[PDB]
């Protein structure tokens, strides 16, 4: 905020824009208020009643989410695992010593305070096997509006056909709209998140197949973090080294935003990956909506470094495409030229001995490592304009790309450097 005046008449002007809060909620700021997350559920009706409730309800268009929650409880209540080591997260010691932990030890059971429904018989305990797998799979199916990508219902149908050969989807085609509402019931999401969190620890459980459909709950609305992992993998550099190659102020603020020190983002098994479905946070701090310049920068740099995932990563709105693209060009060019090949194994204890008697002064050549302090200086020697070898390198990287979707950084990079 600095004073601005109109030079024709010395009139003072106050340039101001509309403001949008859109604050950010971290997971660990939820647990300092409540030391436990509740699961609202109805424990009145019996299991074999709920089986026909949700089977006959599934066959038709009418079904109560309260009945699929109350059915998923008792349908998954007697599933267990033995902890090899202790399990604690955000001050919640879920598992103590060698005692076995169930799938609902993670949350606390509360009572929901009713749907009349309709019942069915002849439904044995052989449907308790896959009906949870089904209802869990429809959460992953019912989150995508693409007509052919929603055909993951064929892979849920297949994964249950593996459990019982004569399994065919008990839902009408109009059902493409039936389970789309299930993702709005907080307790259903608190169920799928507990299922995925449970089966992440107990990996080779006989019912680990249930994780299909709930795997989309892990790190949901946390794309930018996964782009940081993808960049730290594609570049081959450490997290602290990649962190230095951030040359844009927005990516700096966002990188400071993701790396707050008390959110267990590094723990293997934690409540953090499920901060959205558990209700630990209503606005994730690790999304590509609150970290747009980081998503664009890291994804584009990866793409220039021969990435495959980035070919379909989406281009955010309202960011500095020019500065971000130049930064990604210098970074990807630095990593591209500096392969840093070094001998690793020797036979007769003979290693490569570099020759230091090269004194013809081979200057005006790019640096030898991947240090930012040297590539910024070389780039200054290039007048902060990308050299034709950099632009040609990027053209080499983005050309021969085919089948590119619109609004993706693959078509963006191709449309930017391939001409």
């Amino acid at each position, epitope marked *: 905020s600095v004073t601005v005046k109109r030079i024709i008449d010395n009139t003072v002007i106050v340039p101001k824009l509309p403001a949008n809060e859109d604050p950010v909620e971290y997971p660990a700021d939820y647990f300092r208020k409540s030391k436990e997350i*509740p699961l609202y*559920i109805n424990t009145t009706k019996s299991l074999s009643d709920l089986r026909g409730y949700v089977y006959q309800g599934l066959k038709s268009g009418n079904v109560s989410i309260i009945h699929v929650n109350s059915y998923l*409880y008792g349908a998954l209540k007697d599933i267990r695992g033995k902890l090899d080591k202790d399990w604690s997260s955000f001050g919640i010691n879920i598992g103590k010593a060698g*005692d076995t932990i169930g799938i*609902f030890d993670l949350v606390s059971l*509360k*009572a929901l305070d009713l749907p009349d429904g309709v019942s069915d018989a002849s439904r044995t305990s052989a449907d308790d096997k896959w009906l949870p797998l089904y209802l869990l799979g429809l959460y992953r199916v019912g989150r995508t509006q693409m007509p052919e990508y929603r055909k993951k219902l064929m892979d849920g149908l297949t994964n249950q056909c593996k459990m019982i050969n004569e399994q065919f989807e008990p839902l009408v085609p109009e059902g493409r709209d039936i389970f789309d509402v299930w993702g709005n019931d907080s307790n259903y999401t608190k169920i799928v998140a507990a299922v995925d969190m449970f089966f992440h620890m107990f990996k080779k459980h006989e019912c680990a197949s249930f994780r299909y459909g709930t795997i989309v709950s892990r790190f949901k609305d946390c794309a930018a973090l996964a782009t940081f992992g993808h960049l730290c993998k594609i570049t081959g550099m450490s997290t602290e080294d990649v962190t230095t190659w951030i040359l844009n102020r927005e990516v700096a603020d966002e990188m400071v935003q993701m790396m707050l020190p008390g959110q267990e983002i590094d723990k293997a098994d934690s409540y953090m990956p499920y901060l959205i479905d558990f209700g630990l946070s209503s606005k994730s701090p690790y999304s590509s909506v609150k970290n747009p310049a980081f998503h664009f920068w890291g994804q584009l740099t990866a793409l220039l470094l021969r990435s495959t995932r980035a070919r379909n990563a989406r281009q955010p709105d309202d960011i500095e495409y020019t500065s971000l693209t130049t930064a990604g060009l210098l970074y990807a060019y630095a990593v591209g030229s500096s392969a840093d090949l070094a001998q690793q194994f020797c036979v007769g204890d003979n290693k490569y001995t570099p020759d230091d008697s090269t004194g013809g002064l081979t200057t005006n050549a790019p640096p030898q490592g991947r240090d930012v302090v040297e590539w910024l200086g070389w780039f200054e020697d290039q007048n902060r304009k990308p050299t034709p070898d950099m632009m040609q390198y990027a053209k080499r990287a983005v050309m021969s790309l085919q089948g590119l979707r619109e609004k993706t950084i693959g078509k963006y990079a191709k449309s930017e450097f391939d001409k």
Partner: nanobody
Amino acid sequence: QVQLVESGGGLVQAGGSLTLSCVASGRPFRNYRLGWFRQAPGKEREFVAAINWGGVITNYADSVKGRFTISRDDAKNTVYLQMNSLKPEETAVYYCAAFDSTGSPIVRDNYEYWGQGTQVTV
């Protein structure tokens, strides 16, 4: 597994109040229904009161509505039950029960765990 211990019984004057408690041991960090039952001399075990896990949904037998009150503190893993305006028809052994779920049944076949029971004479 879960163990339940009933405490708070005894004799009381006809028309007097009393409050039983039930302490749970073992695995209190899991869904489990809480209900009170009783059995009179030569009478089959009957339902008295029940409470859901969260501690919002409750229900009482007709013979005790108004008088009795049920409550639970799952932090201390217990469940109190006030018994005001007692009557000699109220004389029976009172049992604390648990069935693992998210509700409270009105029958005795819905529970899974039972205490040893306390005598209450009026």
